[PDB]
Paper text:
Tau amyloid fibrils have previously been established to adopt many distinct conformations across different neurodegenerative conditions. High-resolution structures revealed paired helical filament (PHF) and straight filament (SF) conformations of tau that were identical to those determined from AD cases. The PHFs and SFs are made of two C-shaped protofilaments, each containing a cross-β/β-helix motif. Overall, these results establish that, despite substantial differences in genetic background and age, tau filaments that arise in individuals with DS and neurodegeneration are identical to those in AD.
Tau PHF and straight filament (SF) structures from the 63-year-old case were determined to 2.7 and 2.9-Å resolution, respectively, establishing complementarity to AD tau filament conformations at high resolution. Cryo-EM helical reconstructions using RELION resulted in well-resolved PHF and SF final maps at 2.7-Å and 2.9-Å resolution, respectively. The docked atomic models for tau residues G303 to E380 were in good agreement with the map and confirmed the tau conformations are identical to the AD PHF and SF structures. Indeed, alignment to the AD structures showed no substantial differences, with an overall α-carbon root mean square deviation equal to 0.5 and 0.6 Å for the PHF and SF, respectively. Overall, for the four cases we studied, these data identify that the tau AD PHF fold predominates across a wide age range of individuals with DS. For example, we expect that the cleft of the PHF fold in DS bears an identical pocket for stacked small-molecule binding, as we have demonstrated with the positron emission tomography ligand GTP1 and as Kunach et al. demonstrated with the positron emission tomography ligand MK-6240 in tau PHFs from sAD.
Author numbering:
A (entry chain C), B (entry chain A), C (entry chain E), D (entry chain B), E (entry chain D), F (entry chain F): 304 to 380
Write the structure that this text describes.
């Protein structure tokens, strides 16, 4: 017995943007209050966390485009 | 017995945008209050979490386009 | 018995951006208050964490494009 | 003709307070936003004013008692 | 003609306070935003004013008592 | 014609306070933002003013008592 696998996916996909001007962007928050109370924390594998935060983000990319692609080929005998 | 698999998907897909101007964008929050109370936290594999947050985000990408694609080819014997 | 695997995915994908001007971007927060109270913290493998934060980010990339791609080929006998 | 005025008001009035303890007082505001827009202001005699304010006051007097008294005696001929 | 005025008001008034303890007083504001816009200001006699303010006051007097009194005696001929 | 004025007001008024302890007083503001914009200012006699301020005051007098008194005696012929 013989097994042949040919894995040849072809990609020609374009993700693109055009813009004239980014322009006036104003981000003026007036800060509040946050309180968190806890006794014990206990984190193990691959935990990702935020506790007690007051964060402001202004994010103005000129493009900001994304292309996420994953190829997988498991085999067994 | 022989098994032949040919995996040749072809992609020519375009994700694209055009814009004249981004223009006036104003983001002016007036901050509130947050309180969280807890005794014990216990997180294990692949937990993702936020507790007690007061966050503001302004996100103005000029394109902001996404293309997410996944290929998978499991095999067994 | 013989097993042949050919893994030849072809990529010609472009992620691109064009912009005229980035322009006026103003980020003027008015800082608040944060309090966090805890007795014990206990973190193990691959934990990623923030506690008690008041952070401001202005991020204005001229492109800001991303292309994330992963190839995997497990085999067994 | 003769005019006699005797002005002899007698005051023995007490304004008083007693207290055991002032105790726990917490004042935790989360700041908002204020905007005021105007072209021209024009103020004359005895004007008292506030424009565009975000103020917090905690006032805990141990007594805090007031006694306001006014005596007046106009005369004409 | 003769005019006699006797102005002899008697004051024995006490304004007083007693307190055991002032105690825990917490004043924790989270600062906001204020904007004021104007072209022309024009103030004359006895004007008192505030424009564009973000003020916090904690005032804990041990007594804090007030006694305001005014005597007036106008005469004409 | 004769005019007699006797102005003999008697004051025995006490303004007083007693306190055991002043105690824990905490004043922890989180500073905000203030902007003021103006073209012309024009102030004349007895003007008192604040523009564009971010002020914090903690005032803990052990007594803090006030006694304001004014005597006036105008005369005309």
């Amino acid at each position: 017995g013989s097994v042949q696998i040919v894995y040849k996916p072809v990609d020609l996909s374009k993700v693109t943007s055009k813009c004239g001007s980014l322009g006036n962007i104003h981000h003026k928050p007036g800060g509040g209050q946050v309180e968190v109370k806890s006794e014990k924390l206990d984190f193990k594998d691959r935990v990702q966390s935020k506790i007690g935060s007051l964060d402001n983000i202004t994010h103005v990319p000129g493009g900001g485009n994304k292309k996420i692609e994953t190829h997988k080929l498991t085999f067994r005998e």
